[PDB]
């Protein structure tokens, strides 16, 4: 919808209600991802490359604490290739990373806010 209506505020109140906390939510930006090669923060690296023992941001964040709410703030700025990753998060509830360990989002909340329109009906 419009800006300044309180989207992130509603998401943080929802995270407040069923954790009594504020750091259980996993906010990841989408204003970082203008470049096409910068996708691998949330997957990892294939075997034979530099960061391999670490893994991924969005996978190691959910291998522990498997009840979090996740946030994708301003998903318009992401160019149309990040949309192909979370295409398979939805409809399956699984994700794979560099080691080949399928993490399962079967009991998490997914909320992704946008900014399209802004004035129309």
């Amino acid at each position: 919808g419009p800006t300044g209506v309180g989207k992130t505020e509603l998401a943080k109140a929802l995270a407040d209600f069923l954790f009594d906390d504020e750091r259980a939510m996993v906010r990841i930006d989408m204003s970082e991802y203008g470049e096409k090669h910068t996708v691998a923060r949330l997957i990892g690296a294939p075997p034979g490359y530099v960061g391999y023992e670490a893994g991924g941001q969005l996978t190691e964040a959910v291998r522990r604490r498997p009840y979090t709410v996740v946030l994708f703030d301003e998903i318009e700025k992401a160019h149309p290739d990040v949309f192909d990753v979370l295409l398979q998060v939805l409809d399956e509830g699984r994700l794979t990373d560099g080691h080949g360990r399928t993490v399962d989002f079967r009991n998490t909340i997914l909320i992704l806010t946008s900014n399209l329109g802004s004035g129309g009906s």
């Binding site: 090669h37 034979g48 490359y49 530099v50 391999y52």
Partner: peptide, 26 residues
């Protein structure tokens, strides 16, 4: 009357190895 009869031994010392971790150069 008693002799000593010295004995042998076997020593082990292994070796580490490194991985090279290529970089995709972008």
């Amino acid at each position: 009357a008693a002799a000593a009869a010295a004995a042998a031994a076997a020593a082990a010392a292994a070796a580490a190895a490194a991985a090279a971790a290529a970089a995709a150069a972008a």
